[PDB]
Amino acid sequence: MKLSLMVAISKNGVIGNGPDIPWSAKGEQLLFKAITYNQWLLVGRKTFESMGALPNRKYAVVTRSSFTSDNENVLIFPSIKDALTNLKKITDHVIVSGGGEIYKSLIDQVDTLHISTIDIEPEGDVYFPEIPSNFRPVFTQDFASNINYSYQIWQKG
């Protein structure tokens, strides 16, 4: 089973402010929607509760409480380890989609990074892990918008 990771990182490393993403760069959301279409996403409970279950995606949500969901596209797991154990039996690809705790736990296990660098330096308290040395960028594209952003795909190798 392949593991991807998708995140938008502001220029100072902030990816979140409380439960929110502290920016709105018009168009960057299109990358997220395109790459995650009909994919399995692994998200922590805080980010899931904050984003909700968008259509045309499947969600594996991890929680140590007894958080539930009656949405048919949402599975809940008591641990990241159990999510992975089960996911590899029901799909061949999972996209790690946050938040901060989930990226910290999974960064060293993923095969492909999707990183949008957002041209802003906002206030926030959630950060992205430092990127392991074996990842290298293989594709880059710049976008002009209300807040500029740059999309970059990294591969392990």
Ligand X SMILES: NC(=O)c1ccc[n+]([C@@H]2O[C@H](COP(=O)([O-])OP(=O)(O)OC[C@H]3O[C@@H](n4cnc5c(N)ncnc54)[C@H](OP(=O)(O)O)[C@@H]3O)[C@@H](O)[C@H]2O)c1
Ligand Y SMILES: CCc1nc(N)nc(N)c1C#C[C@H](C)c1cc(-c2ccncc2)cc2c1OCO2
Q: In whole angstroms, what is the distance from residue 125 CA to residue 111 CA?
A: 27
Supply the Cα-derived Rg of the chain in whole angstroms: 15
Residue with Cβ nearer ligand X (17 or 157): 17
Tokens representing 82? Answer: 């159990």
Q: Which does 54 bind (CB under 5 to 8 A by kind): ligand X, its own copies, ligand Y, none?
A: ligand Y
Closest CB 132 distance from its own copies, rounded Å: 18
Task: Centre a 10 Å sphere on the Cβ of residue 100 and count the other Cβ atoms it contains.
Answer: 19
| 93 interacts with its own copies by CB under 8 A | yes
Q: Is 83 annotated as a binding residue?
A: no
Residue 6 binding ligand Y, by CB under 6 A: yes
DSSP per residue over 22-67, as a string? S---TTHHHHHHHHHTT-EEEEEHHHHHHH---TT-EEEEE-SS--
**Quick check: 17 binds ligand Y (CB under 6 A)?**
no
Please select the residue that binds ligand Y; options are 14, 40, 98, 100, rule is CB under 6 A: 98
In whole angstroms, the minimum distance from the beta carbon of 27 to its own copies comes to: 4
Stretch that binds its own copies, among 43-51, 82-90, 124-132, 141-149 (CB under 8 A): 141-149
- Cα 144 to its chain centre, rounded Å, is 22
